[PDB]
Structure formats: C-alpha cells, structure tokens
Amino acid sequence: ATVNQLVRKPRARKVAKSNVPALEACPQKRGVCTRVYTTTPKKPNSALRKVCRVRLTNGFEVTSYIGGEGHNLQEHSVILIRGGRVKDLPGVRYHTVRGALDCSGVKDRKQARSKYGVKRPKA
Template identity: 80%
Template sequence: MESVQLEHENVNELSDSKGDLSVNFSTITPKKPNSALRKVARVRLTSGFEITAYIPGIGHNSQEHSVVLVRGGRVKDLPGVRYHIVRGTLDAVGVKDRQQGRSSAL
C-alpha cells in the first residue's frame, strides 16, 4: 500500500500577485487584545479559489464585482486572512488625502 502525501496548495504558487474579482465586502473583529472593525473582502481568484483579503488604508470605494489585485501577506490579528488587496491598481483606488508620502501602489 502506497502512502500519499497531501500538499498544501498555495494560491500565489506561480506569481507574486493576482488580479481577481471581489465577491463581497465585510468587517472582521481582530483577536484579543485588539479591538477594531477591519475591512476585508472575499475574492474569487482566476484559479477558482475563494480567499479573504485585507483592504489596507483608511476608507475604500470597492464594491461587489470590483476587479482587484491581490498580493500575499497575512494580517497578524485576523485569523485566516493571508492576503492583501493592492491599493491604487485596477478598481481599488489609492487612499484619498493621505498625509504622508507612500509608494504609488498604496
């Protein structure tokens, strides 16, 4: 009898970012001891996976069926959130009236 080893499938296996369709938006409360309403989106990838991605920055205008760019990088106080949405690309606009300089991607 042969033993079969299961591999954990990584969404970003072949590329560092993916452009995909957002399904819905919500807020999640972080783990203890933090307290907030963190903005997240359920995103359906072109590969068929459906993931939860964090929306960084203050405020966003993304709606259902927005096309967003997703990069890797977890959010430490949100369980199960292992991806970030890249601001300033595709349908995700940059942070409005940002006071301090940032790269064009944020």
Template identity: 75%
Template sequence: ISKVKTAALKGSPQRRGVCTRVYTTTPKKPNSALRKVARVKLTSQVEVTAYIPGEGHNLQEHSMVLVRGGRVRDLPGVR
C-alpha cells in the same frame, strides 16, 4: 518539501481577482477594531479572503483587485 505560505497565488507575486463580498470583521483577542476585508475569487479559480489596507476604500462587489501575498496577524484566515 516546504509548505507555501500563499498557496492560492500559485507561485506568482500577485494575482488578479474579482471581489465577491466586501465586509468588516473583528480582530482576535487583545485588539479591537472593524477590519475591512473582501472575499476575492482569483484568476486561478481560488476564493480567498483579502485584507483592504489604508483609510477608506472604494471596493464593491465585482471590483477587480490585485492581491498580494502575506497575512494579517490579528485576523484569522486572512492571508
């Protein structure tokens, strides 16, 4: 019995969801930046924090997004 890294995806490779909040956070100790993240309510009714990669984005509240598994190493709680 192994603990799943991305339990919120319910075993699927990606999951669709709706942004409930788009904001920035700061990474933990040796790094310094304003990382863009979003609270996403998935179709599996789970609310997760998702990282927004790349330079610039057009996400707002109520945007539909496709969430992929994995984690961001320097942001605690973002998977």
C-alpha cells in the same frame, strides 16, 4: 535543548513561522471582490475594515485584506493581490494595493510619495 520542544519559538524575534498555503500559478494577481463581509467577533476589535472573499480557483475558498486607506472598496471591483498577512488577521493570506478602477485609496495624504504614488504639495 530537547529539540522537539525547543525548535518551536526559542530566541529569534521576527520568528519565521508564517503559514502561506495554496499555489496553482503565482502570488502577484487580480482579485474580484465577490461578496463583502464585516462579520466575526474577535480580540482585535477590527473597525470599518470590510475584509472580503475572492473567487480564486486554488482548491479551497480564500479571503483578502483591504491593504491601504480609502473607505470605498466596493463588491463589484477587481484589485491587485500580494503577500503580507499581519498577525492581526485570521483566515486571510494576502493584502492589496487598492487604488485601481474607482476605489481611489490615498486621499490628499501628501506624505505617501513613492509608497503609493502621489504628486507634490506647496514646496
């Protein structure tokens, strides 16, 4: 009831705190794959997830999550960028709808329908 302590976390369970800095135009964008990483020891033992950096002109350096299945998301590519920074990721402030170019994304996952854009199976 002492509001300066109380306001931080109190009874909501979506808890609205999200930190999403930087602007300079709009959030829905194209993002160059610049330079790949898979470095950094953390608590979530993140496996095979190549989380790379993007050359966004925004006043500081930034990074993006791999946004969906399909292992090849190479360093020469340029995908779409959007919000959705799961609790799992430090530093990053976006994810990616990544089956543009040659990077493919969903392979034969019949269930994916309107969520990614796949065609029908054997009826």
